A paper describes a structure:
The endospores of Bacillus subtilis are encased in a multilayered protective structure comprising core, cortex, inner and outer coats, and an outermost crust. Among the proteins required for crust formation, CotV and CotW are unique to B. subtilis and are hypothesized to be instrumental in maintaining spore surface integrity. However, their structural organization and functional mechanisms remain unclear. This study determined the cryo-EM structure of the CotVW complex and revealed its filamentous helical architecture. Structural analysis showed that CotVW possesses a negatively charged surface that enables pH-dependent binding interactions.
The 3D model generated after applying a helical symmetry operation produced a high-resolution cryo-EM map at 3.32 Å resolution. The filament had a diameter of approximately 10 nm with a helical pitch of 13.4 nm measured along the grooves. The final atomic model includes residues 1 to 125 of CotV and 18 to 98 of CotW. The final model revealed 1:1 stoichiometry of CotV and CotW. Further analysis showed that the central β-core was composed exclusively of CotV, whereas the peripheral α-helical domains consisted of both CotV and CotW. Along the helical axis, CotV monomers stack with a helical rise of 9.52 Å and a twist of 153.09°, forming a continuous spiral of subunits. Accordingly, the CotV filament assembled into a two-threaded (grooved) helical structure, resembling a double helix. CotW formed the α-helical domains of two adjacent CotV molecules. α1 (residues 21–32) and α2 (residues 44–82) of CotW encircled the α-helical domain of CotV, contributing to its structural integrity. Notably, α3 (residues 90–97) extended toward an adjacent CotV subunit through a linking loop, thereby facilitating intersubunit connectivity within the filament. The filament surfaces were predominantly hydrophilic, and electrostatic analysis indicated enrichment of acidic residues along the grooves of the double helix.
Numbering used by the authors:
A (entry chain V), B (entry chain V): 1 to 125
C (entry chain W), D (entry chain W): 18 to 98
Write the structure that this text describes.
Amino acid sequence: MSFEEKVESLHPAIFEQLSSEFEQQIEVIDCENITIDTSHITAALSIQAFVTTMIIVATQLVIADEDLADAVASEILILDSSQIKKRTIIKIINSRNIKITLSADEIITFVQILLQVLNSILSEL
Amino acid sequence: MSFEEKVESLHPAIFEQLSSEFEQQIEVIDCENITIDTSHITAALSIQAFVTTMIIVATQLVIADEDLADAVASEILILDSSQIKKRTIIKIINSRNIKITLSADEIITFVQILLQVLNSILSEL
Amino acid sequence: DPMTKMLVQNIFSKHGVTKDKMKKVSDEEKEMLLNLVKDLQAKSQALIENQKKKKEEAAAQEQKNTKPLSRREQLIEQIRQ
Amino acid sequence: DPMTKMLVQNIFSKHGVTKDKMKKVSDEEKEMLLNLVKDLQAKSQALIENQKKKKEEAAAQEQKNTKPLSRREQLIEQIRQ
């Protein structure tokens, strides 16, 4: 069905773009045990990406004149581009054990901001 | 022939000792793609081990009074034991891809130091 | 909530979509959106509670770990044996 | 080179092998050592160039990878289709 296929096709395209902005490099010197914890990074990005396409696909469906639809959709994309950070908690447990942890707290809080936009848009319509 | 067999017999004994000092443990949590790159670690250790036995076998052959030969040979072994490190470059390409890399740079630079000792010993004799 | 009201009204008040441009459609497409939004609440909140319980648990085993006045007497018992 | 001269002379100046203890042998065993040392140079340098080309190549694909001012416009073209 048209609405289901369009949201499910825009989701992977948006998701891969979000993931590409989450690549960094950590270099560890003279260590034995290294633990890399990136849990919930993919889950939070999946939720944010799949809820972002809902915003730009809701206005696209209702509003004709596709030029306006592209304009509002583009403005949403730039909004998530800025004011998003990433933490790298490097916890040194022992003299031989370190633990690099990627924090999804900023993505989690930004999901709330986008969720309020989704609720406000739906109430507007 | 005596010189060829003695160097080719001391080489594996020295090489296995060097390898035994290059064992570590890396623990990865919640990751899909893991790449372990240990290239040139065995090649650099082979060169350093096979050039170390040349130093202790050159002085052993020329110099009589085996007690002195053991003394100089032991001093060479302790030299390589200290001031040798190891790097573990953990490059996080994506949120699901990490790449543990073992660097042979320290072994490479130490090969130059041992090579200069080999040249100086040969010029002395 | 009133906090997030004007950051979506101001963009609409710009050259974008205006009030008179709203189609105000009310059909079978509206209800299928409403249940999806409620599905978003269930999934997002599950992530929130999972992160929240991880945060307080990370502050739990350190509180349970009793810190004595001095951290050097724990190795005096075994050496004597 | 003069840099590495004294770290081998100082150990020999110790209770180890002295100048008068040198046999100073010059026979068929000397030439077979000389060609082996030159073989060491060829093999070691091959490792050095292999590592050197790996190092600059690792710094090559990142320079070729153009970094734009913003890294979020690459996913706007495909979504519109």
